[PDB]
DNA sequence: AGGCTAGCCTGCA
DNA sequence: TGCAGGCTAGCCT
């Protein structure tokens, strides 16, 4: 199972409750990418940590947030926190790489959630 | 508070969990009627049991059901059970009065939830 | 019949 | 003004 494999790459120490939510977050993404033929691309990006992977996109919602098991957040933040930066505070601490065509900031119809298409930045000064 | 007053007219015996759900049902209806200026009419129908009150309408959903908290049901059944018949089992046991212009069965854009616009009927079975 | 969530509304910083 | 969280109609199983 792809879900369990992807969960093995999860960052940080999680308690019982967070482990269950994290599993739901991965399941939710796996369902969306399976219908658009983007699942293999997610496995490649996560399991190899490769920046030279395609955009991994999901439809953008009106307010940009994604709800998973009663929790709401920005999906690129959710998946960057899960697989790269467990203490990631907000979207203000993420900047997309130059080659990311569907970065969150672009506000296109689709949003890229490939964590290796983002870089962590210090909280903006101004 | 109109919620506490309308809840005083609630029928049946309720435990702690049902009491909280019933309060949510009344709150949910009060919110909807406040925006359409029909709250005073609900107070009138519930406190006077007058069949000669206007239709108390809420927008009709695609499947007819209403969700209050995490429970789904037919809204005229919900509010008829709350204020008139606590052992009302289904919509099949209810029929709208002749003067009800927005009866559930009519399937109009708006649905009447005035309990005094409905009567109990023999179960079709 | 019942579960999940995007959109809607709302109060807070 | 953005940000956060409650509620539920529409959609799905
Ligand atoms: Cl792509
Ligand atoms: Zn990208
Ligand atoms: Zn009526």
Numbering used by the authors:
A (entry chain A): 10 to 135
B (entry chain B): 10 to 134
What did the article's authors report about this structure?
The GC-rich region of Gsc contains a conserved GGCTG sequence, which resembles the GTCT-AGAC SBE. This GGCTG motif bound Smad3 and Smad4 MH1 domains with high affinity in the EMSA experiments. The Smad3 MH1 domain complex with the GGCT oligonucleotide was refined at 2.12 Å resolution (space group I41). Most of the hydrogen bonds with the GGCT site are very similar to those observed with Smad4. The main difference is that in the Smad3 complex no hydrogen bonds are observed from the ɛ-amino group of Lys81 to the G6 nucleotide. In this complex, we also detected several tightly bound water molecules at the protein–DNA interface that contribute to the stabilization of the interactions.
Smad proteins consist of an N-terminal MH1 domain, which binds to DNA, a linker region with phosphorylation sites for network regulatory inputs, and a C-terminal MH2 domain that is phosphorylated by the receptors and binds other Smad proteins, LDTFs, chromatin readers, and transcriptional co-activators and co-repressors. The receptors for TGF-β, nodal, activin, myostatin, and other family members are membrane serine/threonine kinases that phosphorylate and activate Smad2 and Smad3, whereas analogous receptors for the bone morphogenetic proteins (BMPs) preferentially phosphorylate and activate Smads 1, 5, and 8. These receptor-activated Smads (R-Smads) form heterotrimeric complexes with Smad4, which is required for the transcriptional regulation of most target genes. Focusing on the human and mouse Gsc promoter, here we identify specific Smad-binding GC-rich motifs and provide the X-ray crystal structures of Smad3 and Smad4 bound to several of these motifs. The structures determined here reveal that the β-hairpin is flexible and adaptable to bind with high-affinity several variants of the consensus sequence GGC(GC)|(CG), which we refer to as 5GC SBE.
